[PDB]
Amino acid sequence: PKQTLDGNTAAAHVAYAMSEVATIYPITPSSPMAEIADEWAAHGRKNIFGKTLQVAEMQSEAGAAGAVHGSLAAGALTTTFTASQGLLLMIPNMYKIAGELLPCVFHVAARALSTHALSIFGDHADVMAARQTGFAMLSSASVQEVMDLALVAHLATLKARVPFVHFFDGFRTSHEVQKIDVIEYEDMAKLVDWDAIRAFRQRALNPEHPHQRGTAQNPDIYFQSREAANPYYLATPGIVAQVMEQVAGLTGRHYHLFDYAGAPDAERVIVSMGSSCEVIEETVNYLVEKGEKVGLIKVRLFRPFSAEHFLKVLPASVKRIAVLDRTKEPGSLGEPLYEDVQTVLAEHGKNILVVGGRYGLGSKEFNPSMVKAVFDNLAATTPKNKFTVGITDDVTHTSLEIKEHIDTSPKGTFRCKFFGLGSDGTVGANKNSIKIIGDHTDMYAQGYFVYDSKKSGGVTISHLRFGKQPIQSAYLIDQADLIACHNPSYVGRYNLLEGIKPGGIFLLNSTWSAEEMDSRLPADMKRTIATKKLKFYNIDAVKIAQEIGLGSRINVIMQTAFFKIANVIPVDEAIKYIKDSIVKTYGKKGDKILNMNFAAVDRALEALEEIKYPASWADAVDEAAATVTEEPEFIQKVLRPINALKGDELPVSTFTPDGVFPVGTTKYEKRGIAVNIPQWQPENCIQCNQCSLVCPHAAIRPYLAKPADLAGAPETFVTKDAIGKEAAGLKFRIQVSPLDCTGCGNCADVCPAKVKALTMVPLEEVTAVEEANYNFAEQLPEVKVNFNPATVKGSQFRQPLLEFSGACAGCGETPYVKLVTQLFGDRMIIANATGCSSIWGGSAPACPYTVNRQGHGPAWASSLFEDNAEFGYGMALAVAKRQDELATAISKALEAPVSAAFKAACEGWLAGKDDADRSREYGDRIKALLPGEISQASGEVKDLLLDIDRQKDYLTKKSIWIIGGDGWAYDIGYGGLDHVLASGANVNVLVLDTEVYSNTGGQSSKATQTGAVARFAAGGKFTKKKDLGLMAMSYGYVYVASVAMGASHSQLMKALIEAEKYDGPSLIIAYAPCINHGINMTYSQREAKKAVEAGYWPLYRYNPQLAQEGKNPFILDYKTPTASFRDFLMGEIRYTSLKKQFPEKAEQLFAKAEADAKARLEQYKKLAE
Amino acid sequence: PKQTLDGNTAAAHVAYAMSEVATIYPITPSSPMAEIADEWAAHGRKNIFGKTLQVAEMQSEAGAAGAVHGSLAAGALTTTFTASQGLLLMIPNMYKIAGELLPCVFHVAARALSTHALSIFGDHADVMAARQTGFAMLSSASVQEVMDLALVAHLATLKARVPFVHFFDGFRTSHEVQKIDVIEYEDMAKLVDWDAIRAFRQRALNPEHPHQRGTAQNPDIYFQSREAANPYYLATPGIVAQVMEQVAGLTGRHYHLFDYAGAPDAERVIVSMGSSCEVIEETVNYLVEKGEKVGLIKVRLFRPFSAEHFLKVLPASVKRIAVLDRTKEPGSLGEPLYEDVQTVLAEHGKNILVVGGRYGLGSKEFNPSMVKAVFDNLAATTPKNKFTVG
Amino acid sequence: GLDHVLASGANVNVLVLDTEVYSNTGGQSSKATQTGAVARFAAGGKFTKKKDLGLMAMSYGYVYVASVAMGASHSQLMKALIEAEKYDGPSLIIAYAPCINHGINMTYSQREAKKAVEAGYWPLYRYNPQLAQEGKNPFILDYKTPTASFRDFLMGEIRYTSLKKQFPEKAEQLFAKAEADAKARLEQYKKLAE
């Protein structure tokens, strides 16, 4: 049948049919394969063996690879899905699996490796890093080929006993939706070598016919034993070739080990691999029809590399070859495929000039204009070798120049771009628009989707295509027949009409009248509309949504308008298909919600307005640029162009060679995405600063000011006398940053005043006012105050050093780190694990960690997902080493003829160099006396003082903080964390427990509680939550504390200060509410209070210092819960969806979860009593 | 002075002098390096910084690699010792360490990888499995060269900011005892680029001058940012070459990126790497004195592969080359060094017949009788390609 | 990986042969090495106390954990092995295995394990989750009161006497810490049993 799928589903489709067990671990962009395989098992899909696939989630990809090896050796056909860093962690087991000749298929969504920086996007770095494991390697270039070649790999591995890596380009193919021919399970079983399967069962480990495998060998036989497998690798190319003929007989589609396309007498040929082959073949057709003698060699079977099948498809007329590698091996003579082509051509005496290039790293664009630049370089007098395409390399001059733009798209292919907001449905609608066209026309359909790095409120760009000819355009839309803008705020921000075809359609959502368009639209936009003679349409999708009560959901309104103007299918038939997709997509929401979306379709047709514009719009003149601002060089050259969606224009010279970025750059974003912002009521405020504490973006803060500093204050900067003996005679005000606020509403919910001092007002009503208020409050001078930092009110008078991050509105993670920066940010270094905390904490080019007025702030670094504890442990070793070098220079300064005041501060520092307060006290005296002391010294004495001045940044004791999610702490990094905590180092580990893998979509973890439903746990998690805090207490010398900000403000303050002052390992497990729980984020703080009150989350503190005082180290801060446990679970979707999915098993799990919470509570009572 | 050492101690000798922290995890045959480094610290041996080396044992080699990355990023010169399966578990962190241009030296006692069976004995399977990480790779062929080239790697990594894997054949060199010239710590500190060390301290993570490293990047800038480190990799071969001249002035022993030995008018040349070069040079002397026109190219700097320095030492009379790889990549068109030689010779239009072979897997014997069998195959009417010896 | 497999609940039997060193590779330090013992990569002796693997696996509640020693009690080893295998779930057996890297006469290898339990150096316990389903206490302490001197047992093995020969001034400090840690571990097993 024909279905519109993505590469991942196409791979999972074949893999589910051919496998009995599948051990998985989530990683973008390969995790969707395991997600849909888990869902199919929950709904009972049968494979060719008549059973459901068993999905096992491990603690890492290393654990997954070991389980595959055991499952295969024990007699079960096993597969797995992974990519990038995950594939690397499987490489040690891959040597064993290939070495023992076990039939197996790894499906890889090829993704870049973390080098100078993390990139979740696609290239061949991961696959190339395992090319020496002995696995075969088969590449899919299109969604159709993912379907076909996955079946080829599963069929071939049974015959050859050589394991296969079937890999396709991450996102570019794994996430591209296409209408493809799906191969039925019944046909696959008709092609399976059943004799080979039964023989594989006979080799299984079984006590009734035992054997030994995986021995240890001496040098006498290891070499011979390694060569004994050679016949299997010699025979594999022929086996893959014959399997490819079986697929041809079934599908009619002919694949070969190496495929050729282009002129039969071509002289310039490109050799390439992956999705680029689609783009190159599209360009080759265009160039051959124009008379050029060019061709293309598609590499399907990369390993084993069959020299015979490569030369078999190389025309005898070929004189120059360019090999394209989607990877980079620094310092190497050439990239992997390039050295293979060069070798085989040398082995057969072909005198052909070969040149290699790099492309598409991290999903870099690779379009036909680039393919011609590669072909044209081959036509040059001296072709440049070791080149790059798609960047401007003005440093090393490896980039090819894209001289001209060509359009190689087949005639008759419709092209569409859609600009939408997050959570408005634009992307979901275009997914169903493709299903409408593909399921109901003879046309091929294709859709690729671009999301922002931000978690919510970010721009999304949808690229769709459909034509009578097959769609090989594996690149973004060059020239669009239609462009739609689903958010009017983008008007004036982004070049929406780039590449719009003349006489094309432009679709807009706004409340602007045909007359108001002259003022609200930019001149360059009005110029393009009139010059290219575009059909301009507009619909007030917002008003239609509010009249029916749909809210912000406008996709159905805009989708209906699309089929109305695009004339892809007659509008009468199109509307029927749109109503059907509402049930199939939004059915699970309600019966009333569907009739509200059905009425939206009808009112959308009637409210579509074609705008007749004056032809004089062609002569509209750009606005006068307001007085420019003097922003830093990095903000001007890097941050602004990237946010303006022009980052691809930046040359290589823009960037540092080691991925180092400045701090405090998110304050320059000013996104202004809030619908409502808090408005402060000065008469109702008790001056408690709780609103600044819970703000997930540091957008609301208290400000103190002497009465003289209120000179240039706006009329709306109303102040009140400051309460407290420390701030006597001062003014107080709670001020919000309107452009950085997210509108979550957490600050208003926590406000404990009798009358609410914070009320939610719409942003647009008070944005002009509150902007002037914040701009004045931000420029207030620092005010030294003696408020106790150990209290909530005192801590918020300290400047926050984590501001305006990319976390979700109301995130439960960022409030924790923000409080830490206000207490110890002056002198702390952060080792952050990969996860949400690394995505909102360190996504280029914006850094949310900032500095204070003295220029000091937290230094932030993220290495890998699995090593974060040992990463931070290494920092603690080095920082101690740097302080040791300084103490040596200080001790030598005592013996030198220096001032008596200088000697006094040095002796004071040496005694308290390991005390946070004392090292700052005597250190600052040393820093103050150094410049005058250096002026009064000479000779070697001056050199000794100059060496101390070089190291004065290590006088103040640092605070190492290791931050990560529960997925890192409970699973993949627990082994490393256990070792770091057991070592006794003076580090502070902060675990942000969201009980799911929040970054990757919300997958199951050992931190997930009983009965909760998450991805890879479709039927609910049976096993109870792993008690990380209890195991770390077994050492006795590790400080462990369980906190929850929403439950108790005072308990969080005490645990944070006690853990940091502890001269040893400290572990803080913080409850962080998350959107993957399925709750209203406005009450995120309230959800944490209900968690502790219902016995769902414990609050305790284990202090080893109390044991040294003869006291009990364990303190139970909450003994008797007062709320119902069952009522708290029903307040979150992650537990209610269990009743909707598996209703009969749901009631059993709720009883187990409540019994486990009482057994955990009574266990904490025994340790306390 | 002259002392009788093994390769491991010779490597540990230089590594202890040049490093402040060393995170380790035991694995044969590399664990003796960390064992003797731990003993020296207990007895208070001072490095060129006047302090004792801090040895930290982790829960795995993966934990060791992460600690090196953190210790380097925080401002301490760090090293480690590993091999075989241990080196594989460090490969994910090696991409970060090389990608962030941190000066570092991994000392590897090259050992076979566990495939159909475990083997604690020596070959280049481990080193070849990380040749795409961006680390430089420097090979020692004798106990004397372990001493000298370890110093070259530690000195070069400070100048180039490119991390080095200094590897020597497991057991065959790491456990071979030889009377060698030991280089004094005082001479090493006289060769250290102290300006480079202080600059490396300035890049450390510190709250009083903070920065962000290791960000997450979208497709718009990841490619450009990856190519921005190219000047460092282009300059590394020249830096290693000049560092090799410093060692020559101190020791009198001349190393090059690629070294040649044999007849000046040789027509059959072997390209090889590691301890086999000692055996091949011994055979070449024997064959040249008997009138045969044969030669040998020793590969010292395997990565970055400098095409210029390789062709610089290739006699113009060479007509046939046999490349020897102490590793096996099943199904591949050829083994790693073989494809490198074949590529550079193709890039410069040399019409030379090249053939590749495999040897010495899991410390398989490689003796001069085998070296002649390789040379005699080059003399055949049709030399066999993709062969094995031993 | 072991923590994940035991937490999964699979019907597997994990047998940990605890030699407190990396015996194959020459005798290097491990988290299983006790306080004060000298091994490779711990030239000055291990400061941190022994990691309690058995105690952490008991935190799950559904994992059978047992500490055995053949030289100490033949009958206790038989019961723990049969109970752990019949348990339809994860079972963890931590067995004390004397080794040459301890520095003792291997003729009395069995005798050294008996002295280990009798001096409070090695515990003998069994955690049965099936006892919890019967309303009973899952933890059984099979050896409550030690009868031998703790300091005398350490001096019977070279891995502790070489500390007095290498670092004599720090050696007496570590012996007091090792004996205090064994009593705190023993009283902690008494609280779970009482």
Ligand SMILES: CC(C)(COP(=O)(O)OP(=O)(O)OC[C@H]1O[C@@H](n2cnc3c(N)ncnc32)[C@H](O)[C@@H]1OP(=O)(O)O)[C@@H](O)C(=O)NCCC(=O)NCCS
């Ligand atoms: C997908 C994403 C870009 C938002 O896209 P979009 O243009 O808003 O389109 P979507 O189809 O996702 O939005 C529909 C959502 O809004 C709601 N929706 C929109 N219109 C609706 C309507 N009329 N009726 C009912 N629900 C509607 C739904 O609740 C749905 O969310 P849910 O089904 O997950 O609860 C964003 O959520 C995202 O970035 N996701 C993760 C992307 C990723 O793959 N990341 C890799 C991990 S690092």
Ligand SMILES: Cc1ncc(C[n+]2csc(CCOP(=O)(O)OP(=O)(O)O)c2C)c(N)n1
């Ligand atoms: C070795 C490796 N495996 C998997 C991944 C993919 N990955 C990134 S973040 C993440 C999980 C994050 O979950 P968590 O640790 O709980 O942090 P959170 O997002 O919830 O804050 C995963 C699996 C990776 N980057 N590296």
Ligand code: SF4
């Ligand atoms: S939470 Fe309310 S009472 Fe407290 S400082 Fe903020 S506005 Fe004032």
Ligand code: SF4
């Ligand atoms: S609404 Fe949310 S983001 Fe805005 S100020 Fe209040 S807490 Fe901060």
Ligand code: SF4
């Ligand atoms: S942890 Fe949850 S709420 Fe916070 S940013 Fe990640 S997905 Fe959003």
Ligand SMILES: [Mg+2]
């Ligand atoms: Mg999480």
Ligand SMILES: [Mg+2]
């Ligand atoms: Mg052991």
